[PDB]
Design a protein around this ligand. Structure first.
Ligand SMILES: [Ca+2]
Length: 223
């Protein structure tokens, strides 16, 4: 997250870190057994880390649970990042508590102009690299479809939305991929892509989770 703030330990209790020996992506806990992330975060060999604040210090509220299964969307296209969504099943259920909690899936798609909470352990610099140890947060508004398409001509599908600030300075970034975009208390987006981070006229692009609720529900009813 570039231009964000330190969230505060465990104030984003649905945020997970995906670890393959190191943190490499975020995700969102949607019930005790399942995490939503980005398909471009797929790796074999994922451990889900819940209850994290500092990802480099065991502070006492973590749960580390191996994935048993990962399910990339059947229509994921890694070239365009259309359908950039994945489900990860935990080998055992998380113990839900004040620090480890699920986020609701949406009933309706979020509206342009809504301010959402985006969070992650990704890079904090637009130019260069600095990765934080504690979770960072950003409030960013959803942009209109027309503004999103103008920013990335020929690249935005109906399964993507833009959020952020066209002047630059505030955005998600590498290492935040797969993490949540929460709007009105629901998971509406997944950190998916953008041209650099926090550059002028290049807002973040997010997977539109409301288009995937029926797939998520049928897949979790079946696995
Ligand atoms: Ca920790």
């Amino acid at each position: 997250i570039v231009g964000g703030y330190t969230c505060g330990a465990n104030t984003v209790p649905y945020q997970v870190s995906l670890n393959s020996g190191y943190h490499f992506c975020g995700g969102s806990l949607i019930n005790s057994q399942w995490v939503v992330s980005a398909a471009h975060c797929y790796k074999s060999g994922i451990q889900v880390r819940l209850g994290e604040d500092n990802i480099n210090v065991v502070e006492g509220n973590e749960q580390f649970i191996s994935a048993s299964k990962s399910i990339v969307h059947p229509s994921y296209n890694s070239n365009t990042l259309n359908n950039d969504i994945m489900l990860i099943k935990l080998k055992s259920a998380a113990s839900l508590n004040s620090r480890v909690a699920s986020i609701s899936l949406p009933t309706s798609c979020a509206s342009a102009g809504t301010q959402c909470l985006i969070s992650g352990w990704g890079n904090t610099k637009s130019s260069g690299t600095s990765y934080p140890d504690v979770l960072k947060c950003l409030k960013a508004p959803i942009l209109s479809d027309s503004s999103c398409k103008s920013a990335y001509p020929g690249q935005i599908t109906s399964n993507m939305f833009c959020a952020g600030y066209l002047e630059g300075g505030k955005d998600s970034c590498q290492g935040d991929s797969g993490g949540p975009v929460v709007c009105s208390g629901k998971l509406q987006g997944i950190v998916s892509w953008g041209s650099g981070c926090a550059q002028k006229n290049k807002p973040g692009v997010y997977t539109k989770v409301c288009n995937y609720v029926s797939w998520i529900k049928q897949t979790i009813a079946s696995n």
